[PDB]
Amino acid sequence: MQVNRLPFFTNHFFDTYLLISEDTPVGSSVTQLLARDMDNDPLVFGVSGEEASRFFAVEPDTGVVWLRQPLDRETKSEFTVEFSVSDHQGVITRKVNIQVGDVNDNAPTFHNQPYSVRIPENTPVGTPIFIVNATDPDLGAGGSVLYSFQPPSPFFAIDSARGIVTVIQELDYEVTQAYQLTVNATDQDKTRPLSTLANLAIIITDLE
Applying CB under 5 A, which residues contact Cl ion? Answer: 8-9, 94
- Indicate which of Ca ion, K ion, Cl ion, none lies near residue 23 (CB less than 5 to 8 Å, by partner kind): none
Contact stretch for K ion (CB under 5 A) within 59-67, 91-99, 136-144, 186-194: 136-144
Among 97, 99, 123, 133, binds K ion (CB under 5 A): 133
Decide whether 87 or 96 has the Cβ nearer to Ca ion.
87
Identify the three-state secondary structure at position 6.
Answer: coil
Q: Is residue 46 involved in binding K ion (CB under 5 A)? A: yes
Sheet with 18-21: list strands edge to edge: 18-21, 91-101, 78-86, 44-48
Helix (H, G, I), strand (E, B) or coil at 15: helix
Among K ion, Cl ion, Ca ion, none, partner that 142 touches (CB below 5 to 8 angstroms by kind): Ca ion
| CB closer to Cl ion out of 83 and 110 | 83
The nearest distance, CB 4 to K ion, in angstroms, is 22
- Beta strand ranges found along the chain (DSSP E): 8-9, 18-21, 29-32, 35-36, 44-48, 56-58, 64-67, 78-86, 91-101, 109-110, 115-120, 128-131, 134-135, 145-149, 156-158, 164-167, 178-187, 195-205
Give me the residues that bind K ion (CB under 5 A), please.
Answer: 46, 133, 136, 143, 173
